[PDB]
């Protein structure tokens, strides 16, 4: 948790947003990134390279 | 911190600062950060004008 605030840094946002939207940022990194399993699975076409 | 004294410090090389008010900035109150401690910050614009008023 102390990462994320450093990075936030580098995009012009302070540190005061991620610590006082804790619970709210991961519940958005959980939820997106078991969507991309599912992307997958349901278009073939994204492993055509 | 160093266990009993916390310090602000720059990110790649070890140079420990005391707490003023010019080395931070506030934002809200402290109910809601995880991880929050407590302490206390010694401001440099209040105890020089107690030296000379008082």
């Given at each position: 948790?102390?990462?994320?605030?450093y990075?936030?840094?580098?995009?012009?946002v302070?540190?005061?947003?991620?610590?006082?939207?804790?619970?709210?940022?991961?519940?958005?990194?959980?939820?997106?990134?078991?969507k991309?399993?599912?992307?997958?699975s349901?278009?073939?076409?994204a492993?055509?390279? | 911190?160093?266990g009993?004294?916390?310090?602000?410090?720059?990110?790649?090389?070890?140079?420990?600062?005391?707490?003023?008010?010019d080395?931070?900035?506030?934002?809200?109150?402290?109910?809601?950060?995880?991880?929050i401690?407590?302490?206390?910050?010694?401001?440099p614009?209040?105890?020089?004008?107690d030296?000379?008023?008082?």
């Amino acid at each position: 948790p102390m990462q994320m605030a450093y990075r936030f840094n580098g995009i012009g946002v302070t540190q005061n947003v991620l610590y006082e939207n804790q619970k709210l940022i991961a519940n958005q990194f959980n939820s997106a990134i078991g969507k991309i399993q599912d992307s997958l699975s349901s278009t073939p076409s994204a492993l055509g390279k | 911190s160093n266990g009993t004294h916390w310090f602000v410090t720059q990110r790649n090389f070890y140079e420990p600062q005391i707490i003023t008010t010019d080395n931070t900035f506030v934002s809200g109150n402290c109910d809601v950060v995880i991880g929050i401690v407590n302490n206390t910050v010694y401001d440099p614009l209040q105890p020089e004008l107690d030296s000379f008023k008082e």
